[PDB]
Amino acid sequence: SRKIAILGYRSVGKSSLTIQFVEGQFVDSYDPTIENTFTKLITVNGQEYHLQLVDTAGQDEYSIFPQTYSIDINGYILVYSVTSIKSFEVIKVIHGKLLDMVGKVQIPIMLVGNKKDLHMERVISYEEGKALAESWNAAFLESSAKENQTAVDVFRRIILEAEKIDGAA
Ligand SMILES: Nc1nc2c(ncn2[C@@H]2O[C@H](COP(=O)(O)OP(=O)(O)O)[C@@H](O)[C@H]2O)c(=O)[nH]1
Numbered sequence: 379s380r381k382i383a384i385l386g387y388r389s390v391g392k393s394s395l396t397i398q399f400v401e402g403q404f405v406d407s408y409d410p411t412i413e414n415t416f417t418k419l420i421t422v423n424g425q426e427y428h429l430q431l432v433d434t435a436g437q438d439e440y441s442i443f444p445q446t447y448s449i450d451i452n453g454y455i456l457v458y459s460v461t462s463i464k465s466f467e468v469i470k471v472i473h474g475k476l477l478d479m480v481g482k483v484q485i486p487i488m489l490v491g492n493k494k495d496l497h498m499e500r501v502i503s504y505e506e507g508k509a510l511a512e513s514w515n516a517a518f519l520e521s522s523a524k525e526n527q528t529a530v531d532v533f534r535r536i537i538l539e540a541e542k543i544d545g546a547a
């Protein structure tokens with residue numbers, strides 16, 4: 379049982395992949411940007427896995443200081459956009475600090491790149507992102523809400539690293 383926190387700029391497509399991922403199905407999904415908690419129970423290798431993710435925007439991209447973000451999770455999935463130097467740079471910021479705040483051990487970190495159909499432009503480099511995810515020992519993933527297959531790939535790849543990071547902490 380681990381809850382993964384979602385950190386994605388505005389209209390980055392959080393709610394889109396949150397619904398497409400959790401359900402594992404690309405549905406119409408065309409609502410505003412409401413915050414909430416989601417859940418996804420699945421079995422990997424016969425082993426049960428219960429994940430719960432949240433999409434919030436209290437103040438900052440996610441606010442490091444007390445602001446309803448004092449949840450009790452055990453995961454983190456930051457969504458970076460292949461078009462918003464803002465989405466990926468802030469994600470790298472909130473992380474640096476956040477990490478610095480908890481000063482804990484290796485926790486499940488997932489760097490997912492949403493809005494893949496935009497990658498056609500790819501403003502951020504797969505590398506820079508690689509070195510980043512490698513820095514925190516996180517996994518770098520690039521998918522699209524409008525695409526299930528990609529999502530799925532993010533579901534397995536994450537649970538996987540989730541395993542490694544678990545061995546550490
Ligand atoms: N091109 C593209 N747009 C997406 C994708 N996922 C969501 N979006 C966009 O996200 C925008 C806002 O919806 P939403 O999912 O609520 O983003 P959120 O405000 O960050 O949660 C809409 O303009 C959607 O087109 C995607 O996979 N590809």
Ligand SMILES: [Mg+2]
Pocket residue numbers: 392393410411412413433
């Ligand atoms: Mg939203």
